[PDB]
Amino acid sequence: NLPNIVILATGGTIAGSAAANTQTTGYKAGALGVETLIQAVPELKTLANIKGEQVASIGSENMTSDVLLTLSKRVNELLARSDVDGVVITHGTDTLDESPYFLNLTVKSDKPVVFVAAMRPATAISADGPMNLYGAVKVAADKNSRGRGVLVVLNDRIGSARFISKTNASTLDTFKAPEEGYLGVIIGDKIYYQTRLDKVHTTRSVFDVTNVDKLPAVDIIYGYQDDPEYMYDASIKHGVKGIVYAGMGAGSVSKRGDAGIRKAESKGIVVVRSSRTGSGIVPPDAGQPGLVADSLSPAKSRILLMLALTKTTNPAVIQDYFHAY
Amino acid sequence: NLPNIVILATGGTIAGSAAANTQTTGYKAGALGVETLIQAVPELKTLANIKGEQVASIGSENMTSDVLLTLSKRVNELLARSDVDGVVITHGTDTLDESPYFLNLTVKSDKPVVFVAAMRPATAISADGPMNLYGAVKVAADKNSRGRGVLVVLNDRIGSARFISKTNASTLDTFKAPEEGYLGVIIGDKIYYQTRLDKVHTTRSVFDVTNVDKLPAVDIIYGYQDDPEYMYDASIKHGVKGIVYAGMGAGSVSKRGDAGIRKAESKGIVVVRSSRTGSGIVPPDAGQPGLVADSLSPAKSRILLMLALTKTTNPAVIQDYFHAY
Amino acid sequence: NLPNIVILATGGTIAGSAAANTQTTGYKAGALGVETLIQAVPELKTLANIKGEQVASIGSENMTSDVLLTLSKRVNELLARSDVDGVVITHGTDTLDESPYFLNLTVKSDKPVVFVAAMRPATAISADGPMNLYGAVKVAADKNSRGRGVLVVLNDRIGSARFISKTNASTLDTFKAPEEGYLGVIIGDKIYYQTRLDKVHTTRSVFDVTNVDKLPAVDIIYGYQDDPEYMYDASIKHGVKGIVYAGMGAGSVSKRGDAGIRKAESKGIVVVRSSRTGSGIVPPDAGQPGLVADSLSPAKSRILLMLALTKTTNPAVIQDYFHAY
Amino acid sequence: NLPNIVILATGGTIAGSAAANTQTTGYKAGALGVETLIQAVPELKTLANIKGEQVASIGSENMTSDVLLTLSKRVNELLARSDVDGVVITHGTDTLDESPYFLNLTVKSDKPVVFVAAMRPATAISADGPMNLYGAVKVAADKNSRGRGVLVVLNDRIGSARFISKTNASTLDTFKAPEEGYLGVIIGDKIYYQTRLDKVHTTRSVFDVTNVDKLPAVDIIYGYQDDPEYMYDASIKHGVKGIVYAGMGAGSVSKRGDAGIRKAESKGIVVVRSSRTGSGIVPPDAGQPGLVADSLSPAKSRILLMLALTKTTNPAVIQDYFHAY
Numbered sequence A, B, C, D: 001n002l003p004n005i006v007i008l009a010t011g012g013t014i015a016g017s018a019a020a021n022t023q024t025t026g027y028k029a030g031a032l033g034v035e036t037l038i039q040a041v042p043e044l045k046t047l048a049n050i051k052g053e054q055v056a057s058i059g060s061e062n063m064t065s066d067v068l069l070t071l072s073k074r075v076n077e078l079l080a081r082s083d084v085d086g087v088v089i090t091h092g093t094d095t096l097d098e099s100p101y102f103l104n105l106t107v108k109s110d111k112p113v114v115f116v117a118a119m120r121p122a123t124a125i126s127a128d129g130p131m132n133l134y135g136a137v138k139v140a141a142d143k144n145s146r147g148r149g150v151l152v153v154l155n156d157r158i159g160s161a162r163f164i165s166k167t168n169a170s171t172l173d174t175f176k177a178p179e180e181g182y183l184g185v186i187i188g189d190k191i192y193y194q195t196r197l198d199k200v201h202t203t204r205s206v207f208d209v210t211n212v213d214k215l216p217a218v219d220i221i222y223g224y225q226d227d228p229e230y231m232y233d234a235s236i237k238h239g240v241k242g243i244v245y246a247g248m249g250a251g252s253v254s255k256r257g258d259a260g261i262r263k264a265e266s267k268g269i270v271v272v273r274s275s276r277t278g279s280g281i282v283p284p285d286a287g288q289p290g291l292v293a294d295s296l297s298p299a300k301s302r303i304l305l306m307l308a309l310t311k312t313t314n315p316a317v318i319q320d321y322f323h324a325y
Ligand SMILES: N[C@@H](CC(=O)O)C(=O)O
Pocket: A011, A012, A013, A014, A058, A059, A060, A061, A091, A092, A093, A094, A095, A117, A118, A119, A120, B249, B252
């Protein structure tokens, strides 16, 4: 009796197709279904009983919070069933920073939720998709993968949704977390778990979007030399509920950024100072406005802020989420 | 006789002072003069004859293109003299991604221009400033450091202005370049050069800002899920000459980002697609609008685009600069 | 009432002194007592009630298994007392791969055992010792640091004794674990735990050396092109109980290395195939002799094998230790 | 017309064939000829005119100095011809630390010598071989690859033979150089060179093996706690010409290692102190015996020492080679 795994497809280059096998970038992309991905890897039949389901068919650069609501609700419906042991989600790499972390806070089950992607299309020479999908299903079918939070599997690595991000624009090994490493690795058709996420996730999370139809809008504004104050004005004008600041260094604000953040806060907008660096802690500073993002990236900080605004508008409670989640 | 090195001060945590040494973050920053930094390390006298100038006294988060013009003009004025062998620039870490790369394209000399910074204030326990400054002066005083482009010295490393960036928000070893490494290292009071910059820099650069009073305005717009098109509308309204897109993955645009970029291009604004990932190549794509940033980060792409706009607005010529510089 | 922390000194460059402050390497090293290190950082009094003890005064390159036995028995006696909350151990960096992992398997307490070291002597410019010691004591005094296994603190990082190793010969940031990251970080006088060790350690470990006078001899033989078979003959002649093979790639043996290992196994010597690469999994292979080291480095594999030989010689039980510890 | 590239096969997992595609490790390895590798990638015909030769059919773990001597002589006579523009060498990954660096010092031409390997067998799911081979041939056929030293191409990276090493036992992205990065990358069917090797290589190298029948024997002895002195006695007994010490930290010797090295030096054996860390500089120290390996790893130090012993035994001259090569 093999485990029962459901593969939910949302699109991405993993389900992409090009005219030539030498083409990995800059091509008229064609989408493939979940059944085509399953049929491409007949070795999945030794791991688990597989059922395919197409949630979406878009590039992750076009992934929206509305589709994330639909995805999370469907994952929760499936994991509540006794005939589903785990869920594998085929997704694009461009916003694989956000999607798994969204599910890390919204999934109400200990059963494995494994995001999977590919940097090369299925038609490409040495396409990474087939092995990544094999690894993802293997992880989801393993009972030892439970209670570890949402997992992300690419290039023989098992990364945490809380730390893993696309660190390189175009390489196969792009998904890394320099300061936190990987939760596990897949070597020689065997899973080796090494670390556990020391943050609040899945079953112990207070965030629930089961009865949420629309999430609060949150913008991300970059921090740099000569950064305009008018970007904050644009966010205020359109009435966003939150703003994540991709700050210079440890979330440092310029005179124009400081003025823009305080103007947003006076209108009731919750601002969180993250970092454009790529990793590390943004420490508390009473001399600067806004909350701090802890070690959360601008992309993941936005996700947490959106979900935090569904529960509260209290800055201290939201700050507590950033240090715990 | 010893070489003649001039230390130009712009500010930063390297010249920062706190009431307690346990404080490294969120403190009352006390700005120190260039002479105080020189007197703190009397071992600089064994390396070279030191002179100090105070170009600026601000945090790098407030570093502007106007101050960079003043800095670049002063560096070129000093390096043209026979009594100056090299220059050391004490700067902050928050925008040390931009400043050195600016001078990497504007300095008209093979003489060493070495940027130096510190993550911990001078008062802090195990302050990195003193050793960083010693290493920077040592690098600038070495004649073998010539013709290598603008250098950045922190944590015993010599990084290229073209590749090095603050990769972590709060650590001493934050300045890294995972795909390109370091040009050299400083170990045991000795310099070990290992790699050379294979890009156009300094003397061979066509970018000259000697007769430039004001640089063209360039904004950076971040790429993420549900990214607003109105950010581009804000840039267009304020009449920016360039827009750098910190794209999802390999500079991928959403439907709103695509619309915002094409709207900017119709107004004559040159848009360059960079990446929010942290490293890697953004490959050319005819299916997407805007130019491609090659391996240049959003911060450095903005610097190059700003300087490219002083000479031309032609997309093909600017694209050529992005692959060469 | 502040926690009671005991600082045990074994030596190292953290307690080293040079002729000049520009000397970090190649000098006549002097020794500093445990009290000299404590008085150098008066900020330790705000963290905990400190009591220093001098266990040894040697370079870690000369650290032996006999001294580790004495250290482990002493730590166990200290932590068994109700008036001790944690222990900080000043040690050298050269064999900081072995020592903490030894205590990770032998210390029977949830109370923090924090190893600390320095890459620069206390006399050097921007000596890392003072801050590393401050960070180590802060970790040991924190109640949240309990039950996390043996910790290693340098350069604002909290690494696991199971994963952390000296990855660079001479840099301050040398202690890394690319595949596993850090358990926590120390930023802005605050501790941020991110991951937990998912292996058997400390309290749950079966390795008890309280009644052990002398440990079994284990050698490490390197794997390379034209590697001699006579090195294995030298180990067999001296009657070692174990041999760790620092293998090429994934612990691959040459024809001479295969012959040497099989000859050792016939004499009752338990051989474990590790890797010279620096990281990763050495997978099981029925076509090759010896056991596999999992992700354990040659240095750490020797430590585990040495402790495993005090309990059993059964290859199946020892292999189970390598996948669980 | 297209360039003329010769592919020299030595063996390895790139030419490996397993029973099942889920088998990447621990399998009965099969041997695939050079023509089988060429016919597997028909896209090589668009890059260059290909001719294949079978130099060897062994795993790199069994690669010997006599085969490297034969390989180097064959590469040199091929590059001397006008009908050969570059050479691609299919090799194993286990000793890809040594082989390319050997040729980096022995090749007497600016024509590209590109080593290529694969972590997964040709039969495996998402086998890296085909893309790596395509990338290697593309690099060898590119005129811009000339005068850059021996290149190593895997996972879309172009690494220098001087710096690149297998850093992980079992992953696709194993070939890294933390402190030096890559010379270039292959993204979207385009080569992007970023750094150049700032060491003496190929054409300018003084190490000629045209008239060498047998290379001097050089052993590598590992440095660790309780390291035996008898390993050095075994090397002296068999009359090796050199000994590379894989030292603890920055090549630090124990009391037994110090006694063993000085005993080797008294018998005329040249000893070089390298590091077991994985990267970094081993600094000169008059207080310790033996020469220093600079930034060279134990594997690469052995290669340089072996080639230096064909010319001289003078300690100061060999030490100079270690800082220049
Ligand atoms: N544009 C693609 C990139 C990828 O999947 O690799 C996506 O994110 O859907």
